[PDB]
Curated annotation (Swiss-Prot):
It comes from the Eukaryota. This is Cruzipain. Belongs to the peptidase C1 family. The chain holds residues 123 to 337 of 467 of the full protein. Disulfide bonds join C22-C63, C56-C101, C155-C203. Purified cruzipain is able to degrade itself, yielding a complex mixture of small peptides, and a major 25 kDa fragment. Glycans are attached at N47, N170. Hydrolyzes chromogenic peptides at the carboxyl Arg or Lys; requires at least one more amino acid, preferably Arg, Phe, Val or Leu, between the terminal Arg or Lys and the amino-blocking group. The active site is at C25, H162, N182. Coiled coil: none annotated. It comes from Trypanosoma cruzi.
Length: 215
């Protein structure tokens, strides 16, 4: 693999967003991966809609939870591959209550044709990411409310409970790390990002990695 990749340097990652009090991390994980994957297919970077998934994806549980994988499939299977612009379908669940789904008034800002699930092995995730772009991962985020910056080297690794977006890694640093886009505003961590040590399954990062595939 290359020694270091950071997809933010390529103009491929949109701004840090804010899930608020809704348990919608899954939606932010998956839509973040679709924004990136769409850019990489040769389109302008477009902000896309989590509210679409939170409100309309009935194969997931709204502000109670969901799986990035079900979100991918619901897009392809039930919404004709369409992902709405964030503009045409703004986030309205900051309070922990999602409104009812609306099937009109929106504009398509990306489409996808499916998703891949990556192996449970950090070296192999990194290989895939190096080439194909940012990846949705699940993590144990228990530790993460105390996080203020730097590379974290000890992470409570017991149960997956949060969905985030893996955007780069650096193997040449004193402690190899992953670069992870979180959805708790820019007020948290490194301007909305976290860096966690790579190679030791910090936060169970290898366990549930996957990506949308665009046309
Ligand atoms: C509550 C929410 C985000 C929460 C936070 O903001 C907590 O920090 N977590 C989730 O939605 C996800 C995180 C996750 C994603 C992928 C694999 C493993 C876990 N948790 C989650 O529990 O999904 C449950 C579920 C399963 C099937 C159908 C509906 C719901």
């Amino acid at each position: 693999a290359p020694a270091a990749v950071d997809w933010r340097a390529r103009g491929a990652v949109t701004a840090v967003k804010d899930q608020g009090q809704c348990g919608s991390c899954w939606a932010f994980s998956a839509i973040g991966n679709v924004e990136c994957q769409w850019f990489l297919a040769g389109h302008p970077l477009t902000n896309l809609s989590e509210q679409m998934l939170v409100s309309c994806d009935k194969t997931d549980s709204g502000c109670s939870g969901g799986l990035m994988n079900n979100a991918f499939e619901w897009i392809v299977q039930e919404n004709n591959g369409a992902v709405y612009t964030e503009d045409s379908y703004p986030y309205a669940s900051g309070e922990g209550i999602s409104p009812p789904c609306t099937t009109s008034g929106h504009t398509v800002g990306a489409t996808i044709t499916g998703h891949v699930e990556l192996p449970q092995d950090e070296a192999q995730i990194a290989a895939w990411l190096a080439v194909n772009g940012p990846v949705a991962v699940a993590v144990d985020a228990s530790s993460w409310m105390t996080y203020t910056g730097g590379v974290m080297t000890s992470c409570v690794s017991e149960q997956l409970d949060h969905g985030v977006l893996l955007v780069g890694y650096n193997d040449s640093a004193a402690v190899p790390y992953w670069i992870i886009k979180n959805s708790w505003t820019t007020q948290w961590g490194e301007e909305g990002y976290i860096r966690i040590a790579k190679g030791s399954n910090q936060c169970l990062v290898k366990e549930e990695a996957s990506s949308a595939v665009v046309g």
